[PDB]
Every structure is written in structure tokens, then in C-alpha cells.
From Swiss-Prot, chains A, B:
Record carries keyword Hydrolase: no
Extra remark beyond the main annotation: Has low affinity for peptide hormones in the absence of bound chloride.
Effect of S92P: In BOMOS; loss of localization at the plasma membrane
Positions bound to chloride: S50, V79, C80
Function comment: Receptor for the natriuretic peptide hormones, binding with similar affinities atrial natriuretic peptide NPPA/ANP, brain natriuretic peptide NPPB/BNP, and C-type natriuretic peptide NPPC/CNP. May function as a clearance receptor for NPPA, NPPB and NPPC, regulating their local concentrations and effects. Acts as a regulator of osteoblast differentiation and bone growth by binding to its ligand osteocrin, thereby preventing binding between NPR3/NPR-C and natriuretic peptides, leading to increase cGMP production.
UniProt disease annotation: Boudin-Mortier syndrome: An autosomal recessive disorder characterized by tall stature, long digits, and extra epiphyses in the hands and feet. In addition, some patients show joint hypermobility and dilation of the aortic root.
Biological process according to GO: angiogenesis; blood vessel remodeling; negative regulation of cold-induced thermogenesis; osteoclast proliferation; positive regulation of nitric-oxide synthase activity; positive regulation of urine volume; regulation of blood pressure; regulation of osteoblast proliferation
Protein known as: Atrial natriuretic peptide receptor 3
Keyword annotations from UniProtKB, A to Z: Cell membrane, Chloride, Disease variant, Disulfide bond, Glycoprotein, Membrane, Receptor, Signal, Transmembrane, Transmembrane helix
Amino acid sequence: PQKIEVLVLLPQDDSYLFSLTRVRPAIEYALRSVEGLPPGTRFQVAYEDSDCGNRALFSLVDRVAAARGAKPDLILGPVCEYAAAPVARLASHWDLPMLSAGALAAGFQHKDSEYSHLTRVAPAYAKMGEMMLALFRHHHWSRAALVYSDDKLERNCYFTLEGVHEVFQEEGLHTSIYSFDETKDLDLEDIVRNIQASERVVIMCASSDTIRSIMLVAHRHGMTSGDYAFFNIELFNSSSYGDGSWKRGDKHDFEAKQAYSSLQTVTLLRTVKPEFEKFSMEVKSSVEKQGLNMEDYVNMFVEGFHDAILLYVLALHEVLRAGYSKKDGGKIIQQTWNRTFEGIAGQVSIDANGDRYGDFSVIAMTDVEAGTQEVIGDYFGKEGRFEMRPNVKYPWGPLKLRIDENR
Amino acid sequence: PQKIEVLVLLPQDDSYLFSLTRVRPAIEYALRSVEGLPPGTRFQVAYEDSDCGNRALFSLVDRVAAARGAKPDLILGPVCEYAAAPVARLASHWDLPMLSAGALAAGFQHKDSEYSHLTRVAPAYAKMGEMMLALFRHHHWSRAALVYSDDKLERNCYFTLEGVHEVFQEEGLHTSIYSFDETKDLDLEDIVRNIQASERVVIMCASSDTIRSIMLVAHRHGMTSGDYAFFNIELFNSSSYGDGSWKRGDKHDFEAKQAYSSLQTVTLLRTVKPEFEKFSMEVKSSVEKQGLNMEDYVNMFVEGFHDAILLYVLALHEVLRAGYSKKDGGKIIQQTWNRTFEGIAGQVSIDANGDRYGDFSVIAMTDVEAGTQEVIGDYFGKEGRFEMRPNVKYPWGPLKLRIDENR
Ligand SMILES: *[C@H]1O[C@H](CO)[C@@H](O[C@H]2O[C@H](CO)[C@@H](O[C@@H]3O[C@H](CO[C@@H]4O[C@H](CO)[C@@H](O)[C@H](O)[C@@H]4O)[C@@H](O[C@H]4O[C@H](CO)[C@@H](O[C@@H]5O[C@H](CO)[C@@H](O)[C@H](O)[C@@H]5O)[C@H](O)[C@@H]4O)[C@H](O)[C@@H]3O)[C@H](O)[C@H]2NC(C)=O)[C@H](O)[C@H]1NC(C)=O
Ligand SMILES: *[C@H]1O[C@H](CO)[C@@H](O[C@H]2O[C@H](CO)[C@@H](O[C@@H]3O[C@H](CO[C@@H]4O[C@H](CO)[C@@H](O)[C@H](O)[C@@H]4O)[C@@H](O[C@H]4O[C@H](CO)[C@@H](O[C@@H]5O[C@H](CO)[C@@H](O)[C@H](O)[C@@H]5O)[C@H](O)[C@@H]4O)[C@H](O)[C@@H]3O)[C@H](O)[C@H]2NC(C)=O)[C@H](O)[C@H]1NC(C)=O
Ligand SMILES: *[C@@H]1O[C@H](CO[C@@H]2O[C@@H](C)[C@@H](O)[C@@H](O)[C@@H]2O)[C@@H](O[C@@H]2O[C@H](CO)[C@@H](O[C@H]3O[C@H](CO)[C@@H](O[C@@H]4O[C@H](CO)[C@@H](O)[C@H](O)[C@@H]4O)[C@H](O)[C@@H]3O)[C@H](O)[C@H]2NC(C)=O)[C@H](O)[C@H]1NC(C)=O
Ligand SMILES: *[C@@H]1O[C@H](CO[C@@H]2O[C@@H](C)[C@@H](O)[C@@H](O)[C@@H]2O)[C@@H](O[C@@H]2O[C@H](CO)[C@@H](O[C@H]3O[C@H](CO)[C@@H](O[C@@H]4O[C@H](CO)[C@@H](O)[C@H](O)[C@@H]4O)[C@H](O)[C@@H]3O)[C@H](O)[C@H]2NC(C)=O)[C@H](O)[C@H]1NC(C)=O
Ligand SMILES: [Cl-]
Ligand SMILES: [Cl-]
Ligand SMILES: [Cl-]
Ligand SMILES: [Cl-]
């Protein structure tokens, strides 16, 4: 009765949204449920710090050399670009299956070889551009201002939007890019001004607050009344990037409530299924008990790794029946591509290239007086269509107007 | 009486100038001479194919895991960028000393950490820019056309010249870049024309023949008589990049002889010391006997690795005396930096950052009738000065004129 041995390579520093501490709960939650459809086997999981860098490769390597050539049966992570690339190169070499909710970089989509043993469970950066482009086709838009902060680290926002940018170029849409890092004082006044003289549609990606601030300034300039379309992206369904919460409890709450009436927050497709609440509460509990309290406990990564466990099992089961073993990594990976199944937060489809299709929701303020938010549209990556949710009540408000770039 | 174990990671494909077959002779030649100043120890060298890519990391890793955690005492190579980066990352991790005649990329000069255990024995791409810049200061030039072919592989030429470019930008020199790949038909006619309407000084990097061809076209346009300064770079002192040999034995020999009177070939500092002839003949012999006959047997890489062996020994000796062992890689590397010694092809100085200083020569035709080439200038990286060789007889010829960019 032998066991499946998995190596989980994630950051030790809880400052990352995909740190071992905030991710492990979810991985274990999936292990529990999966254990009750393999034969009659158990799991053995090792959590190593990737340091979101070279450490990841090091562990995997030392681990193997120190275990007299014994390589794991499944590798989860790394997430970071330069941390995941080498590990994935090794996985392909040692015919191991590597599943990550990271490896978002666009280079990771060329699996003609060194990356043939990788499948990305989370939507890659490129998927935001595909979504945005469909939105503009629906709204008949063709120009836009891309505003984003810049890490000079992971540059999550920089890549998300530059991805969008890069897509619009090929399709002929004209854009205006505005970069800046929130680590420094915000000369947002300068930005908001340039924007009002540049485009009618703005797509932003930055901290929850940097977004709220940009809105107050554009509100001060009365651009918040319907002649401007504002979009902030909640990267990896993390509150830290702005989920549309205009309230704070300060001098500007009312001012902010009104401003947000023109803001549309793009998030991962909305779910409310109970299973997801049980999941959320439990993960919160775990990270709670272990001293750490802020942020949200469920983000794109946390949900991704839970779903990566399920995907592995489904694949394994199908490989066994074919006569192969948990040791034929490529065979497992192949079985992992072009497949759909239900995750804790909704459907999860992997395209024929082993990359997750991106499903998104668009949340807008539908009751300006109340400040009540509500999803009004969804983008399904598989079918590649954007669709406005039927029977959403919006009797009056700035979203009733038709933006126009003839200015 | 224990032995030093070295891993040599180089390409298997002899199409590379630094392939295991063309490099090994030189490494062995250095091993022989070194063996007669360590104690009373011998060497043990393993030659693994790097595939000029991921293979390098793989071997090093499998090799170690398969030898129950036994890591070599010295790693030679890889040369290729993406092949050497990971190996060097591991070296730093396993406190191993890595010496390469490659790792020419500019990122490899930041040894604040992941690259702290690397020392580059060959002059890095950046060194060409430092040399060229000094030449222009001496010639009082300030504008130039950078012509180079483009691999879309290693892009040796692309990087050499873009390095020069990148340096001129910071120093305020204006440039014109002309890219093209010799894999396709050469529309050189278009180039030569643009150039004559652009600058008076041209710096090229491309195959021996692509250079000879560019010269015949510029000669056909009579730009070869002294109003234009032509420079081709003999990358890694390899004939394949043009060493100034205008003769071929075709219809155009005479035409070419005249054209080359305006060409100045930049090579690695010239040597004629006997030891270097013995070295050259022997390496030629080895690669000869082993079925392979073209190209030249001594290039920057071949000489580099011979010199890397000597540098290791010098360092080791100094580490022992300090009370450390062949196992303190960093200690050895440190002892390898900021050091000068005589190699088989002349002095070799390593700067305080562990990078070789570039010493170059400039060969020009000093007897236009005869077609006789001769070095007329040298650039010493350490002192960073360009100097024209005294008492070189040039009574008449296009090199007697003073180029002028007032056109
Ligand atoms: C990524 O990010 C986006 C943006 O945030 C997500 O958007 C959604 O976020 C959550 C996901 O479920 C939704 O909120 C949840 O909705 C539950 C149902 O609410 C009903 O709707 C009305 C609306 O007026 C509400 O007032 C009423 O309560 C309805 O039931 C609801 O569940 C939560 O309930 C408690 C609130 O803290 C709490 O206790 C639980 O109670 C239930 C009731 O039996 C049980 O499950 C159990 O007993 C629990 O104890 C618990 O926290 C529950 O979660 C809450 O309203 C809950 O917040 C958002 O509506 C939705 N966002 C919007 C604006 O549409 C995406 O879903 C996400 N996507 C991905 C891919 O991750
Ligand atoms: C990288 O690339 C550049 C560009 O090519 C190099 O430039 C130099 O290249 C070589 C390096 O040594 C030089 O050529 C060698 O010079 C030897 C001395 O020649 C003398 O000068 C006159 C010039 O008119 C010459 O006619 C006369 O012969 C003088 O002796 C000479 O040695 C070679 O001799 C034989 C030729 O094939 C051959 O046999 C040997 O004979 C000698 C004699 O006793 C002994 O060593 C032994 O018996 C051998 O059997 C052997 O091949 C010898 O090498 C040849 O002229 C030889 O080619 C170039 O002059 C010089 N280039 C120029 C134009 O200046 C750089 O040096 C190089 N740098 C680096 C860092 O690698
Ligand atoms: C990738 O997966 C799909 C399977 O579909 C998906 O997977 C399921 C589990 C769910 O996730 C779904 O959401 C997805 O649909 C494979 O792709 C191709 O699937 C199509 C059908 O989806 C299949 O088509 C064959 O059959 C059609 C008929 O449907 C034939 O085409 C025409 O049919 C009409 C009549 O319907 C005739 O009048 C025409 O003459 C013509 O025949 C034809 O026979 C198709 O071959 C298709 O074969 C299949 N593969 C292809 C060709 O891309 C992939 O195989 C999976 N992996 C990949 C992409 O390689
Ligand atoms: C890097 O190596 C050099 C050593 O020099 C090199 O190595 C030798 C083996 C050969 O390869 C040579 O080609 C090279 O020269 C170290 O760099 C610095 O070296 C200098 C001298 O080269 C040294 O200077 C100290 O001494 C000077 C006097 O020479 C003092 O400076 C002034 O001196 C005048 C009188 O001469 C006084 O009137 C002034 O008041 C003033 O004192 C001063 O004391 C200098 O410290 C220097 O100390 C040394 N290191 C420094 C400071 O960079 C490096 O140590 C090696 N590694 C590195 C770069 O860290
Ligand atoms: Cl990571
Ligand atoms: Cl480490
Ligand atoms: Cl290599
Ligand atoms: Cl391989």
C-alpha cells in the first residue's frame, strides 16, 4: 500500500499571497476530501521554502541528492517566475508532473519542451488581455488608458496590464500607459489630469487604496459622473488590489461612494456555493490560529492549489487505467490538459496547452444611493465571450450612459 | 594523497567554438604543465555535454545525486548564457568555484550573490564597448554606424555591438544600427548605401565572408579610399569573423586587396611567444587526429580554459596557506579575483569583480601594394588606454587621412 509523495515549493515570507502558511490549509483541505478516488493509497507532502527565487531549485535538488536519487511524485509550485522556471525544467527532465497556480509569465506557454511537464492551474497574465479585449468588443470601445503601479520586484500589475496592452496592439486598439510606484509619494493629480485629456476609458491595477485615491481625485475633477469608464482589476481576487469597497470610515466616505458609481471592478468569476464557504472559513481558521490575521484567506492562489490536488488525482486515475504509474509524469500531465472539473470555487477548465482558461466577473455599483455593488457581467475564457447578466436592475446612474472617444 | 575533481561542462556539438572536442586539448595541456605547484596531488576531470542549454544543469545535478551528494571541487563552464546561469547559481549554493571563458552576458557582472562564485576568464561583451569608446576618444570620433548580423540563437554579434552601442549612449556618441541575418540573402547594397549617407565610421561584426562582401560593395562605391573608417571585429580571435584576410583566390582578389586598405580588424591583443606556438600546434594536432579539420584551433575560449586551470591552481595554493581547503569554493574564487599572471597567450588580469580585463590589438594594412597586414594599435583594459604602436611605417595610404563627420 504505497504513498504519493508531493513537494510543495512556496515562499516562507507570509508577505506573499501564495505563502506556505496561507496556502497549506487549502492543500490539506483538498487532501482530506480526496482521501474520502485512487486505489487505497495515502499522501505524503513536504513544504519547502522557495524564497520565491533560487531556493526552490536548491531544495528540490538537495532533497533528491540527499535521498539517494529519490524524486517526488508530484511538485506543487513554485509560483514566482524565476523560481518556477528551473524547477519546471527539472520536472521535464525527471519526467515529473509539476502543477502550479503561478508561472503566470507568458514564456511559460511554450511547452514544446522544457515546459512540457507543467500545467498552470491559475489564469496566466495573458488571460486578462483576452478578457479585456472581449469587453471592448462588446462595448464597441477601441482606446484606453492603462494605469498601473510598478513593483520592480514581481511587477504583478505591470505584467497584467502590459499583457492587455500587448494584446490591444495586435488588435489595433490605441492605448495610453501610465506607470508609477506607490512606494513613493503619489503625484496622482498629474495623472488624473493627463487622463482626462487622453481617454474616456481607464483600466487600473494598483493597491486597494491607491485606487480609492485615484477615484477621489477624478471625482474632484467631476470625471466620475458617467463620461468616464473606470476599471480597477482585483488581481488574484485579493482585497489588497481593490474589490470595490469605497467605504473606509473617513472624511471622504460619501465622496467616495459617489465616485465609485463609475468604477467597475474586474474579479474572478463569482461563486457563492456553500462548499466554498466551508472552504473559506476553514482556511481562515488555520491561518488565524497560526498568528497572522490580515488580508483575505482565499485568493486565486489559495484556491488554485486546492484545485491542483484534485486535478492530479483525476489525472493519476486515468494514467493507472492506461497501464502506467505515478512515475510517468508526462503521461500524468497530458491527462491533466484539456480537462474540466468542479473546483471549490467553481469550474476549472484547462486548455489543450495545459493552461487554465480565465473566467471573470465585473462588479459595478447598481444602487448609487446605497453604494450597493453587484456583478453585472461575466467573461468565460473557454467560449471566449463576454456576457452581461440578464435582469440586473439599473434604473438610473452613470452606467446608463454610452462612453464616447470622439474627444 | 587526494585528487582535485573538476567537471567540464561544454557543448557536444563541434559547431560551437567552445566545444568539448576543441577545448579539452587545451585544458589537458594546462593540466600536464601544472602537474610539472599544489602539494603532491593529481587531477580528475569529467567532460559533460552542456548542450549549451539546460543539459548543463542536469548533468551537474544528476552527477551529484547519483554520487550520494558528492560535488566536484572545480567547475569549468558552461559558456552559453542560459546554460551557465543555473550552474553558477548552484556553485554559489554548494560553495563551489566556477570558472568560465563564457558567461559573457552583462548580467553576470552582478556578483553580489547568486554569481559570487563565478569568475570570467574571457573578456565579457561589455569589454568591447570600453575598448571602442577609448578608440573614439583617441581618434576624436563621436558618431558611428554599427553593422552586425543576427543569430536569433546566441546572437554573439548582436550583443558585442549592442554593448558598444549601449556604452556610446551613456557617453553621448550618436550611432546608426544596421541589423540583418546572413542566413538569408544579403541586401547589402541597400546597407552600404544607407551607410554612406549616414556616417563616416563603420563598426562591423559578421562572418569572414559577409565582411569581405560588404567591403567589395563599399569599394564598388569608392568609399574604400580613405574617407571612411572600416572596422570589423574578429569575435573571440576566430578566423570565422574576419581576420583581415582579403585574399580568397577568386575574381575579386585584387579588388578586395585594395578595399581592405581601409579596413581595420580588431582582435585580441597579439602574441607571438613560442610557448603559444607549441600550445597552438599541439591543440591543432589533437583536434586533427580526432576527425575535424576546419576553423582555427585556438580562439578566445580555447585559450581561456587553459588559463582557467592555471588561475585555479594559483588560487588554491593561496587558500591552503590560509588554512582552508579545496572545499571552500568562495575562498578560492576570492583568491581568483584581482589577480594577474602569464597565460599561454599573454597576460591575463582579473579585475576586483572577478572579470577578465580586455586587451585588444588593431590590425591594418600597412603595405597597400603587398596587402600586408600589421598591428598598429593596442587597447589595454586594465589601464584603459588605447595606444598606437610606435614606429609603424605607413608612408602613403588611406589611413593617413583624418575622417570627418561634418557631412
Ligand atoms: C473572488 O472575489 C470576488 C469579489 O469579492 C467574489 O465575489 C463574491 O464574493 C462572495 C463569494 O461567496 C459573495 O459573498 C458571499 O455571499 C453569501 C450569500 O449572500 C446572499 O446574498 C445576499 C446579498 O444581499 C446576502 O445579503 C445574504 O446573506 C444571502 O445569503 C454570503 O455568505 C456568507 O454569509 C456570512 C457572511 O459573512 C458567513 O456565514 C455563513 O453563512 C451562510 C448562511 O447559511 C453559510 O454558508 C454558513 O452558515 C456560514 O457561517 C460567511 O462568511 C458566508 O460566506 C455572504 O454574502 C458572502 O460574503 C459575494 O456576494 C460575491 N461578490 C459580489 C459583490 O457579487 C468571487 O466570488 C470570488 N471568485 C473566486 C473565483 O474566488
Ligand atoms: C588572436 O588573433 C590575432 C589575429 O590573427 C593574432 O595575431 C597574431 O597571430 C599570430 C600569433 O603568433 C602571429 O603569427 C605568428 O608569427 C610567428 C612569428 O613570425 C615572425 O614575423 C615575420 C612577419 O613577417 C614572419 O614572416 C617570420 O616567420 C617571423 O618569425 C610565426 O610563427 C609560426 O611559424 C610557422 C608559420 O606557420 C609555424 O612553425 C613554427 O615556426 C617557429 C619558428 O621557429 C617555431 O615556433 C616552431 O618551429 C613552429 O614550427 C607556426 O605556425 C608558427 O606559429 C608565424 O608568422 C605565426 O603565424 C601574427 O603575426 C599575429 N597577427 C598579426 C597580423 O600581427 C593574435 O596573436 C591572437 N591573440 C590572442 C590573444 O590569441
Ligand atoms: C481537447 O478536447 C476536445 C474535446 O472537447 C472538449 O472536452 C470536453 C470533455 C469538454 O471540456 C468540452 O467543453 C469540450 O468540447 C477535443 O477537441 C475536438 O473536439 C471536437 C468536438 O468538440 C471534435 O470534433 C470532431 O467531431 C466533429 C463533430 O462534432 C467533426 O467535425 C464536423 O462535424 C460535422 C457534424 O457535427 C460534420 O458535418 C463535418 O463534416 C465535420 O466532420 C470532426 O469529426 C471532428 O474531428 C474534434 O475531433 C476534437 N479534436 C480536434 C479535431 O481538435 C480535442 O481532441 C482535445 N485535445 C486537443 C485539442 O487536441
Ligand atoms: C585589488 O588589487 C589592488 C592591488 O593592486 C593591483 O594588484 C597588483 C598585484 C597588480 O595586479 C597591479 O597591477 C595592481 O596595482 C588593490 O587596490 C589598491 O591598490 C592601491 C595601490 O595600487 C592601494 O593604495 C594604497 O596605498 C596608496 C599609495 O600607493 C595610498 O594612497 C595615497 O598614497 C599617497 C602616496 O603614494 C599619499 O600621499 C596619499 O595620502 C594616499 O595615502 C593609500 O594608503 C591606499 O590605500 C590601495 O590600498 C588598494 N585598495 C584600495 C584602497 O582600493 C585592492 O585592494 C585589490 N582589491 C580590491 C580592489 O579591493
Ligand atoms: Cl514561489
Ligand atoms: Cl540558499
Ligand atoms: Cl555552454
Ligand atoms: Cl535531457
